[PDB]
Every structure is written in structure tokens, then in C-alpha cells.
Design a protein around this ligand. Structure first.
Ligand code: CA
Ligand code: CA
Ligand code: CA
Ligand code: CA
Lengths: 104, 106, 102, 104, 104, 104, 106, 102, 104, 104, 106, 104, 102, 104, 106, 102
């Protein structure tokens, strides 16, 4: 009943993208969600194209999707290994359904 | 795919921000309002302006202003995509919004 | 097939979708009512701001208001009796009452 | 009138301190506060000892306090130019009372 | 110095509340005051709970007062950020004393 | 001695046109006059082209005038059923003479 | 009919806002002042400027300024109708004011 | 036909129509006097600011001022006696005194 | 901080009152003061009852004072919005003390 | 030893030219000088082309000078009936020498 | 005669506002300083700028700036007469100052 | 709030007084202070009696003090418009306390 | 013909005509000295800021300074004795001492 | 072990170039260094092309360098009579090494 | 020789002001950073901007902006020498920096 | 030839040359290490922020840290023993240890 979630971000300067002075609202929303889930022992793993290029090749699902749609298709979110979202971050509603947690 | 494009829509003067007030009830207005709300839910903001409510923006925005000089106000609504005129007289089709946005609408 | 009738709170326009802030529940039910309308199915709705008298003349709505106040709105009648209060019917409900797949 | 709030962080690798995989919850809390304030037009400026060492010297109130207690006193928060908090970030309650903004 | 006056209306269908056939005389009176003030360069800003729900939450002074007394307390008028009137609109006399403008 | 007054406005977003933030001085003047007369049991009926198109057709005097002069000729004021004013609202002086009241 | 048009009149430099001071006593000035007052009574405002009193407006207003570059100040009075030059050297006739305004003057 | 003569308060110019604020009564009487002038009919007016001596030498105006002060102005004489004080003659009056239809 | 000085003259034929052959020495004295101040960037605004009757009504402090004492009280001088002088113009000494400018 | 001084100004809106809000420094200087001399029973007569055109014709000295140089040559100052200055106002130094007074 | 014309002079960068400091001692600088002072005494102000002291005015003044783009700074001093370039490289002759000013200099 | 500091130097040959071969150490010290302040956006304006004689007369506080003590009292330093120091330049410590800037 | 020599106060440049404020007396005497120079007549001037030693070595100037201080400057010597103190010679004076018509 | 230093500046308005309101940071740095060394009886002589043109000709080293590189090559610093720096002022580090003093 | 020229460099968007962070590690970035630091030591300041950090400067600077309109952002880095485009796509060679600066680099 | 190994303090990037303020000592040692690398000579460096475990497993570095704390960093090992603490090796030192002329 609990689906596993893996996020492949675009190339960013830090794992959360929340480094600099201008805060992207969507990056903050998803980082807060991930940190909430983490507090509860639910791990959403994320990758950064700048830090781990190889996983964007070695994951065949992500690789084939990037071949068709390009790096502009990032972020890609996998749910149980299936592409579930592309170009925007999953909605908190999606994250609650997938994890069975009730996130604000 | 392409990077998502910024979309900003300049409505005619209407009695409410969505045009869904009153009697005429143009289904286009409902189509585009539904699209805008679906995007909002996904964290994508399509900024709208209403001439009746924010007249100063139709001036301050140089692109919108000039187009209006050279076509009149019967050219509203104007939709800018990454700052440039993309559609006028009519609201962007769902196909276009879907293309500019990367979101599979409907 | 069942008759559905909706008594809204007082709103500034018939769908409540006037202002800058769109209530997602209002747009949901408006979209449903428009789809029904296109199937030839008419879900009558009332706005307390414009049709105050119907909230008095419908006895079932009137008695419910005496007991619970405007807080109870919207009220949805289904074949003449209260089926939903305070929130709009779910799309699942509408489909079941109309037999249309929304 | 509006109390001016200015925060002097310890040395960090980015302006919010949210630069790695482990999110320090205090750094996240204060970043979210500053973002919510910024949405209201209220600007809380902050400095990072790593990139602006000079301002920690030229600000007399900060410099005197660090001469006394050392860099371990950071973060220091000034409210209208006076030291209001050191060692820890201001609480959300404090930030709320100083700005007149509900930060729940 | 000039007292800042800011009015938080109940939910209404338009910014002045003068949106139908029956003119509420209090709404008319306060609209005329605000217009006369605006002619003198004095800006009384007002909010409508219907279109700006968020500001009734983010303004701490208004939010605390509504948490306590509920939406029936509206209109609330702030003078220099403090609650000066609730339940009813400020009288013309009050508005006149706060602004130094004769509003007969 | 008291003439009956009926005003046919242009298409407006509300019966008084006083809905939004910018107050047209002439709309406010005429709305205040109408409300004063109303307080005294003198009824000036007004129409809005947006809300009652049909009356702009069914009143032959207004219909024939609109055929010649167009909607740009609105507002049209009838006094005892005769066109008396076009394009501007009647002067308060006119309103006092027609109603026998002494309006400010 | 047409919508009423905005009228703004830029006088020469005169010793008073209406020019009705002193000895010369040009009847045109009286004609236009009477027209302006009749409009005022009906809630229609014709804004006037006097060069002697508000010099900065003859600069800040780009249209007025340029015309003055290219004709001189002997081109005053200038009348703008909806922002554009409509008359110069002389005051608008009553026929024109009447046409721009929808009011039956005289 | 009757002689009309008007003694204004002190004003900044002969018609009082100088400034930004036009007094509608002043423009009314100025327009009347100009129409008369064109019929060949001269209504003499005085301005206290420029012709103080005439307010002394006309005995009727002088005595009225001693009793009522500058408050009494404008004074209109009609065939040499005070006909109007404090406001300008109505257009109806002017027409009657001149026999011209204004 | 700078005291704001605002002068409300009687009705006059021009803004300085220096409009004829006989120079009133008080009008000349105060015009020269205002000119010297203007050279220093200090703006003393003045009003003429003849051309701005409305401001004598809308300014509550001036209006109340004239309701009480009549137009013979003019000139009235406000310093920071309060009545500081009436009947006569402020002395050069007063103007000098209020502005910090030597007006010999 | 005391020379008689007569000034013929350009067309101006009042005898001193000091009527409006913007004060020409030279007009103020010469008006103050004239008023000082007047206080001492020394009369400097001045003319305004707007108020007395005829004297600009009937004075042959001024007439012949205007024929050659035009109205742009005004102001013209006569000293004992001789043209003494043209286009600018006499210097206070000139005025002191001509009158035998020691003006500031 | 003509109305007096406004004269504004933009000096090169000099160690003092008049250039009368030091050793070289160009008699032109003394000529023009004497003229300027004679005018001052008669209530006529010739505004001077020194590039070294007020650099921002050589920018803010659009006319001066453009001329400098298209000729270099070896074009200083520039003299404006009623706002327009009248002389460059050299200071206006006394004949010109006398003509622009209506004053009989020397 | 920021104390405004304004310095009135004696007559000197250049604005800093550093115009010859012998550097007066007090002039150098205060120039360096003013430069460091200017780097922080804090403007200490200064005047030179030689080039701005007029401001020493029009500033009433300075003028009164010089009338009393003569030019030998210069430099005079005003802090918020009041005399704070005369005869000598303010010490670096004073400048530091008035501005909140560490000037070591 | 008489030798003229001028000892200025300390000034920022040899004529004192450096700054934004021109002292009319300084320009007057500078113009005179330049006209003389052109007639081949040299009026030597000293600036206390640059030539302090000459104010000591000229005994007449030195003694005058001991008694009256820098307040006495400018001092003008004419054939070696003090002719003017505290103000510059008038143009009339210069003409008389040089025999040139200035 | 102590090298003699002579600086030939560009044409400047005063020996230090520190005369005017805008302070060139490099001119201030080198002037402070020179003044420090002077306090210690170490004399760095400097020339100004405006004040001593002749020394720029009579020093053959400077003369030959200017023939090749032009006045734009100034400032030229000699150390024991050898060109050591051109176009910029010597670094404080250079000055310390050359003089054997430890300058800040 | 020539007067030293002002040099201002507009970097691409990078994760740090020098680009010396991470993995790729373009030796050009190290070359230019070393040059910039050698100049700094001699009191010569080469101002750098990073698009990621100071986006507003890439707008406010009209020259940089226009070039970007007409070439794209793949034209970064742009180097201005006395305000004008001198190099794009690549960082100035040490020879150029040395020439613009009068400093013998390396 | 001697093995050189450098244990940096925690830094934000491998050379510490990330930010707006360049530490001249860091650029000096980075330039040296790059020149060595080009001679085929590898001076391994560690960053405490990314490789914490190596500061524990190297016993010599570990014991030094227990005694002196992170204050001791950077530590330079030369043939396995501490040669420099708290500052980076001088270029002279690097040349001597590598035998390369830097
Ligand atoms: Ca601590
Ligand atoms: Ca209540
Ligand atoms: Ca009185
Ligand atoms: Ca002393």
C-alpha cells in the first residue's frame, strides 16, 4: 500500500536546490515534504544530475525517458520504478497518497 | 521536451477576474479558467489581468501597450508566452497551454 | 433517475466562481453541472442572495435552516430530501444519482 | 514602526545553510520564516561569515560582541541594531512579535 | 505625523460593498469618507475577506482578534497597526480626528 | 408639480456603478442623490443595460433614441417619459427641480 | 453619438488663468471660459494650463513639448483631444467643443 | 429706459473672473453686461480696488456703506437708487430695466 | 528633525500679496524669508484664500479656528500641523528658530 | 548731486513683477531697493509696458531707443532723462551713487 | 536687440574652477574669468562646470555627453547657449559673450 | 536611527586639507574615517570656509557659535544639527559611537 | 618711477583667484598687475604660503607683522616703505605710482 | 639592506593626489605608507609632473622610460635608481621589503 | 603604453563565483581566477558577475543585455573593456588581460 | 622522492577556492598542486566535509586532532608524518619534497 518514491532532479547546485537567496516555492515545498517524511522514517531518495550523472544512465526507465524528452524533462519522479511525474515536482496530495502519510 | 514557458493573460475589462459572472457565459472563459486552475494545482501559475481592475498594467507593460495602439482593445485578450504576444482576440487553446506548459490537460 | 437540486449559500454569482480565489470544490461542482446539462440533465441550483424566497417555500430546506442556520448551506436535495449538507456532492455521488459517467 | 531584523550567520557554504543532504531543522525553520516575511515585503537581511567576513568586523555592535565571546556566539540577531539573540536563531514567536506577521 | 488607517471588511461582493440595489448607509458613509481622504492624498487601504482571505491570517493583530471573537467582529479598523474599532465602521468624527481632515 | 424620473445607465457591473476601487465622481453624486430621495419616499428607478437589456427595447422612447445615437448615448434620463438628459447624469439642480426636494 | 472625449487646453503665458484680466480683452477668451464653465456645471472638466503658472507641464507632456519644438510658442494655445493635438494658435470653436463633448452649447 | 450702475466689492480685475475659481454669479452678470454693451447699452461698473473715490462721492453708495460696510457690496443703482445689495441683479431684472430680452 | 511650516494667507490678488504699487512691508518681509528658505531647500508652502478656498475648509485645524474667529484671524501659520500664529505673519526670529536658518 | 531715476519695465503682470510663486532674484533686488529709497522720501518711478503703453511712446528717449532695439531691450532705466541702463536692472551700486544713499 | 541667452560653460578637468592656478597660465582663462565676473556684477550668471569636480554633469547633460562621444574630451571646453552647442575647443570670444548677453564688455 | 554628522572645516586649499607636502595627521585621520564611512554608505558632509563662506552664515547654530567665539573655533562638528565638537576634529572613538561603525 | 611690491596673505595660488568664489578686489589687482606687466612694468608679489622666508627677511614687513600680525596682510611696499595695509592699492594709486593710465 | 625609493607620479593637482572629494584608494594607501615611513625617519621622495617637469627630463632613467612608454606609464617608482614599478603604485608588501619596515 | 582599461567580466550561471567547485573543472576558469587575483594584489580590480547570483545586472547593463538578445546566453562569458564588448563565449587570454592592464602576467 | 598528503579543514569545495573571497594561501597551494599533477606527481588532499572517515582512520592525523582539534588543520603529512600544521606548506617546501622547481 506504500509506494516507493525516487526523484531525479535537474542539475542543481545542491541536493535540495535551496542553497541561494532566491527560494523557488516548489523546491521549498518538496524539500519540506521530504524532510517531514524523513522524520517519520520514510525515505524519498533524490538525485541531482550534477552530482550523479551515472544514475541517469544506469536507470533504464530514466535513460529511455531522457532519450525521448531531454534533460528539459527533469525533474522525473519514479513511483515503484515507474515514471509518474515529469517537469514539475509531485503535488503534496500525490506524496500523501503514495506514502500513506497526511502531509500539510 | 522544452522548458516550461511563462504565460500571462491580459483579459478584456470584465466584471470579475474570471468572466464567470452574469448572463452571457462564454464557455471559452470556463475552458480557460479550468485550465488555469489545473495548472495552479501543479504549482504552475498563469498570471491573469483584468483591464477594469488593473488598468495600469496595460500601460506599464510595453509589449501589451504597443499591440493595443496598433490593433485596438478589441484585440483583448492578449496572451504573452515568455513575454511575447502569442495569441489575441481569443483565449489560447488547451492544445497550446498543454504545449507551453508540458502538462497533459483534460 | 433521481432529481438533484442544490441550494447554495449566498454567493456573488451563480457558480461562486467570480473572484480572484477559485474554490476548487465550486469549480468541481460547476464542471459537473455543465457536463450533466450537456447530457440533457438539469441540476437546478439556487443562490440565497437572489432567490431568498425559495429557501423559505421549500419546507425541507426551511426546516433544516431553522435548526442549523445558513451554516448548513449548500444543501443538496435528491428526490426532494436532504442528501448532502455543508459540502458539495462528490462526483461519484452525482454519477450515481444521474447514472452518467463523469 | 517596523523593527529592522538583521541576522549574522556562522560560516556556511551557502546563504541559507541548506547546502547539503542533511537539512538542519533550525536552518530550515528560519529560512521558511524569512521567505514568508519576504512575501509580505518584509526584508530580513542576513550575512554569512564565510563570504562577508568584513561586515562582522565593521559592524561595531557585532564586532565588540565577537571580540568578547568568539565566533561560537554566532548566529547573532540584531533588532534595530542591537543584539537581541545569540547562539541560536530567533524563535518563530519572536520573529512574529517583532514583525506583526503570523508565522504559523 | 500621519496615523495609518487600514480597514478589514467582512466578506463582500465588491471592494466598497456598494454592489447591489439596496445601499447600506454605513457602507456608503465610509466609502464617501475614503474617497474624500483619497482626494487629499490620504490613502485608507481596505481589504475584503472574500478576495484576500490570506491577509486576515497573516496580519497577526487581526488574526489573533478573529481567533478570539470570530468573523462577526469584522469590520476591524487598525490605526497605526493596532485595533481601534471592531463590529462597526469608524465614525466620521473618528476618521476626521485621525487624519486632520474636515469630513463634513 | 413633481415629475417622475427614470434613469437608463450604460452597461455597468452593478446597479450604482460604485462597486470597484475607483469611484467615478458623477456616479457617486447621482447615487447619493438617489439615496437621499429614497429616504424621503421618492423613487427614482434606474436600469442597467447589462442586467435588463429588454427594457432598453421595450421602452419606445429609449429604443428610438438608441437607434439614432447608439449605446454611447447612455445614460439616458427620462422625465415624465420624455428624454431629458443624454450622455451625462442630470445635475443635482435638475434633480431638485424635478422632485421638488432641496438636495445638497 | 460617440463617447465623450477628454479635452485639455494649454494656454499661452497669461497674467491670470482665464486671460480675463487687464485691457486687451479678447472675446475668444470669454467665449471659451463660458463654454468651460457650462461644461463644469454638467460635471465635465476641461483642464486648462497657463504657461506662466505651470511651466513644467509644457515639458512633462511629451506631445505638447514636441509640437512646441517644431512650431514655437506662438502655437499656443494648444488643445488636446484624447491626448492628441486637435487645435493650435486659436481656441477650439464652440461647434467642436459641442461635438467632442456631446453637449449642446449656447 | 432705466440707468443701471454697479459698484463691485474690491476685486482683482474688472469682472472678477480672473482666478482659477470662477464665481458663476460673476460670469452670469459679465455675460449680461457684454450682451447689453452689444445692444449699445452701457452698464457702468466700478471696482473698489481701483476707483475708491467714486464709493465716497456717490452719496447714496457712501451712506449705505457707512451703515452696512463693504459687506453691502455689490450695490446696484437703478436710476440712482439702490435696487440690489450683496448679490448681483437677476437676469430677469436686467431684462426688465433695459427692456432687452437676455 | 525639520518643523513643517505652512501659511494660510487672507484672500489676495496674487500668491505673495505683492501685486500692486504699494508694497505692504509685512508681505515683503515674509516673501523674502520664504525665498531665502527656498534657496536652502526648505519649502514653506502657502495658500491664498482666494484661489484655494477649499483647503481652508478641508484642513480641520484651520477650519475649526476660522469657525471660531472668522476670516479676520488670517494669516494663520501652522507649524507641524498646529496653529502657531494667527492675525500676523510669523516674525523673522520665529521662522529662524523653527528652521535653523539665519534669516538676517 | 542727486540724479532722478525712472525705470521702464517690460510688460509684466504687476508693477513689481513679484506677484507669482517664482521670484526672479533681480526683480526682488530692485523692488527692495525701490522700497528702501521710498521709505526715505526718494521716489523712483517705474512703468510697466502692459499698464502704460502710452508713456513708452510719449517719452521720446524711450521711443527712439525702442525703435532701434525693440521691446527686448527693456527694462530701460533713465537717469536725469538719459538712457543709463538697458536689458538688466541697475546695480545696487549704481542706485547708491545716483541717489546718494548707501543701500545694502 | 534679442532676449539675453543662457550661457553654460563646461571646462576641461582643471585643478581649480577658474584654471588660474599653477604655472602655464593661459590668458584665455583669465579673459573669460574676467568676463564672467563682470556679468555676475550685473546679475547675469554664467554657470561653469569643471570635469574634475562635477563629472556627473558631463553625463546627465545629454547634449554635452553626445558631443563628447563624437569628438572626444579634447573638445572641452564646451559652451552651451540656450542649451545648444555654441563653441568648442576654445572659450567664447568677448564679442560673442557681449552679443549673447547684451552687455558691452571691456 | 542614524545620527547625521556634518563637519565645518576652517578655510583650506582643498576639501580634505591634504593639499600640500606636509600631511597634518589630524586631517589625514579624519579623511580616512570619512572614507571608511562612505564605503559603508554613511555620508559625513563637510564644508570648507574658503569655498562655502555662505553656509557658515546661513546655518544658525554655526553662525551663532562663530559670532561668539570667532573663526578660531573651527572645525565645528554638528551631530543631528547640534554642536558636538569644536576646535578639534571628533575622535575616531566618537565617530565610531555615533555611526555604529568600527573604525580601527 | 616708483617700485611696487606686494606681500599677500597665505593664499592657495599666486593670484588668489583659484576657487569658486572670486574676490572682486583680487581680480581687480590681478588685472592691474597683468596690464603693468604688458607695459614692461613688474610688480613683484609674494604669497605667504610659498615664500615664508621673505616675510622674515624684509625687515619692514617683518616688524609690521610683529606688531599687527597676519591681519596686516596684504602689505604693499612702495619704494621700500609700507603704503597700504590690509586692502589692495586702488587702481588710482597704481596709476600714480607707475605713471601708467590703467 | 635598505633600498632607496623615489616615486614619480603623473601630473596631479597636489603632491599626494588626495586633495578633492573622491579619494582614490591606491593614492590613499600609498600616501599613508609614505607618512608612516616618514614618522620613522624614512624618506620616500615623490615628484609630481605638474610641479617639477624638469626632473622627469633630468633623470635619465625616467626620461628614457617615458620616451618608450609615454606619460601614461606614470607613476614610475625607482628603487636604488632602477625602474621597479610602472603604472600602479608599489604594493605595501614591496614597500616593506624595500625599507625593512613592517607596514600594515 | 596606454592608460589601464576597466575590465568587467560577466560569467555564465555557475554554482560559485569562480566556477572552481565540483567536478568538470575547466582549467580556463582557474587561469582567469589566478589572473584576477594577481591583479587584485596590485590594486587592480576586475569585477566579476555570476548570472545565477546577480541576474539583475545582466539586465540593468544595457550593453550586456542587447548582446544577449542577439546571440543568446551561450555567449557568456562576456568581458567588457572600458564598457564595450571585447570577448565572448570564452575568457580573455592572459595576453589580452596583460595588454589591457599594463601588468606583466605569469 | 617524498610522498605528500594534505588534510584540509572542512571546506565548501575541494580547493577552498569557491567563494567571492579568495584566500591567497589556498590559491597558492592549489596552483602548486596543479603544477605537480602536470609533472605526473600526485599530492592527495582530503576535505573534512566529504571524507570524515579518513581523518579517523589515519592514526597520526587522528591523534593530532584529539590533542589539538580541528584548529590543527590543514595538516600536511610528508612520508606519513606531520610536517606542517595550521598553514599550508611553502612553495619552497613543496619543491624540496618533490624535487620539482616550482
Ligand atoms: Ca554556541
Ligand atoms: Ca457583529
Ligand atoms: Ca485681524
Ligand atoms: Ca583654536
Amino acid at each position: 500500500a506504500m509506494k516507493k518514491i525516487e526523484i531525479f532532479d535537474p542539475a542543481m547546485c545542491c541536493p535540495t536546490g535551496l542553497c541561494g537567496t532566491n527560494i523557488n516555492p516548489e523546491l521549498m515545498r518538496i524539500a519540506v515534504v521530504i524532510e517531514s517524511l524523513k522524520k517519520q522514517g520514510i525515505i524519498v531518495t533524490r538525485h541531482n544530475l550534477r552530482d550523479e550523472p551515472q544514475v541517469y544512465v544506469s536507470n533504464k526507465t530514466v535513460n529511455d525517458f531522457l532519450q525521448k524528452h531531454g534533460a528539459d524533462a527533469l525533474p522525473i519522479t519514479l513511483v515503484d520504478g515507474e515514471i509518474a511525474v515529469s517537469q514539475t515536482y509531485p503535488t503534496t496530495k500525490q506524496m500523501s497518497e503514495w506514502t500513506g502519510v497526511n502531509l500539510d
